[PDB]
């Protein structure tokens, strides 16, 4: 089973630097070339360069040429995205992807954001919302994103909307994670939303009950 | 260099109608290297047909692309509210482009929303600041507007919205209003309402609590 795992995301002030790594697994490393996508907020698709892993050589686009650099680690199934000199323009979702084929992306990893801004990391406060059927959790004043919110470690998914983070005036990002449930269980069953922010190394969980 | 000019960047079709989205080379591309790819919100593109014209593992009948000279479709036959994400062509040429992407949504019958307000949480007043949310729950259409209302006066620009993803299987939308007063503030006033105006109500709907 093939599967491409991206890391090395987060936070770089304008003008730094940041490695992205794509480790690769279920396929024999040096049959594919290994390439980076990226994708700015509410935009489209980037093609940005690619390495062989066989030749050893990478190719760029024009626009990355020269600020990018690709390399492979052939022993332990990973190729690197080397990134210097970032501006704003550069904050994005980035993506790796294997070649297979006539030239087409078969597998892609998850996607990792990396943020490029001035601003520091700050971990979020997660307050109840408390029904009274509707609950959830507001989860306040971070920075970066992203943030992910489960409701049970994963059992409760069904009828929950997490919705898209605001940014608030202070630069700061908030988000609200809602869930129905059924108008009659509230004495009952227990819930709780589990919140994970890794730019500030924070895990919250927060019970949320009537008041 | 070769671009891909896409069209329409968005749609909105029922469930079973046909959908054709075009991409435009600017010369000439290979049949073999011109591929489409099918993005969800929250997710890596995925491969949905390869060489103009053949299905990705495990992608559905009612997908199919062709081409015309410099120019190339993709049909969707019979929409499924799971087609819901944006379609992305991609080229091979030496170099690599993406088309800048159609969404596809999906027209569904009017649908009114279940209205919710949660007050500030007791520890989140004690942080100094006062979060009221307002829920408005699985509606169709998009469009809604929300009204806040403190002691019956009517607020402005103290408030931020955020709205879900349509639904892959209802092809409904969820929405987040937030409306942020200092701790200070919130004890200063008694009734905190917020009004919804939708297509699928017949009269304004007030939800509301007090302090």
């Known amino acids: 089973e093939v599967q491409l795992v991206e890391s090395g995301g987060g936070l770089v002030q304008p003008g730094g630097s940041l490695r992205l790594s794509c480790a690769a697994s279920?396929?024999?490393?040096?049959?594919?070339?290994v390439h980076w996508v990226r994708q700015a907020p509410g935009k489209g698709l980037e093609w940005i360069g690619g390495?062989?892993?066989?030749?050893?050589?990478?190719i760029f686009s024009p626009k990355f040429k020269g600020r990018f650099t690709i390399s492979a680690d052939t022993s332990k199934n990973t190729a690197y995205l080397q990134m210097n000199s970032l501006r704003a323009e550069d904050t994005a979702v980035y993506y790796c992807?294997?070649?297979?084929?006539?030239?087409?992306?078969?597998?892609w990893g998850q996607g990792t954001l990396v943020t490029v801004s001035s601003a520091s990391t700050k971990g979020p406060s997660v307050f109840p919302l408390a029904p009274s059927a509707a609950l959830g959790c507001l989860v306040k004043d971070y920075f970066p994103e992203p943030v992910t919110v489960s409701w049970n470690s994963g059992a409760l998914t069904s009828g929950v909307h997490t919705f898209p983070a605001v940014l608030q005036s202070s630069g700061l990002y908030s988000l609200s994670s809602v869930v129905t449930v059924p108008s009659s269980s509230l004495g009952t069953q227990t819930y709780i939303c589990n919140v994970n922010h890794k730019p500030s190394n924070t895990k919250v969980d927060k019970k949320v009950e009537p008041k | 260099d070769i671009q891909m000019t896409q069209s329409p960047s968005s749609l909105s079709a029922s469930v079973g109608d046909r959908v054709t989205i075009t991409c435009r080379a600017s010369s000439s591309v290979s049949s073999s290297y011109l591929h489409w790819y099918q993005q969800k919100p929250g997710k890596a593109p995925k491969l949905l047909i390869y060489s103009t014209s053949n299905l990705a593992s495990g992608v559905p009948s009612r997908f199919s692309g062709s081409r015309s000279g410099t120019d190339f479709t993709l049909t969707i036959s019979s929409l499924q509210p799971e087609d819901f994400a944006t379609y992305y062509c991609?080229?091979?040429?030496?170099?690599?482009?993406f088309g800048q992407g159609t969404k596809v949504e999906i027209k569904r019958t009017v649908a009114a929303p279940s209205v919710f307000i949660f007050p500030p949480s007791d520890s989140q007043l004690k942080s100094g600041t006062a979060s009221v949310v307002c829920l408005l729950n699985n509606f169709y259409p998009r469009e809604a507007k929300v009204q806040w209302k403190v002691d019956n006066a009517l607020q402005s620009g103290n408030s931020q919205e955020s709205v879900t993803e349509q639904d892959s299987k209802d092809s409904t939308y969820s929405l987040s209003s937030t409306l942020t007063l200092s701790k200070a503030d919130y004890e200063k006033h008694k009734v905190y309402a917020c009004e919804v105006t939708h297509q699928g109500l017949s009269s304004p709907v007030t939800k509301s609590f007090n302090r």
């Open positions: 991609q080229q091979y040429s030496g170099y690599r482009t």
């Open positions: 390495i062989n892993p066989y030749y050893g050589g990478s």
């Open positions: 992807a294997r070649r297979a084929g006539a030239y087409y992306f078969d597998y």
């Open positions: 279920g396929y024999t490393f040096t049959e594919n070339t």
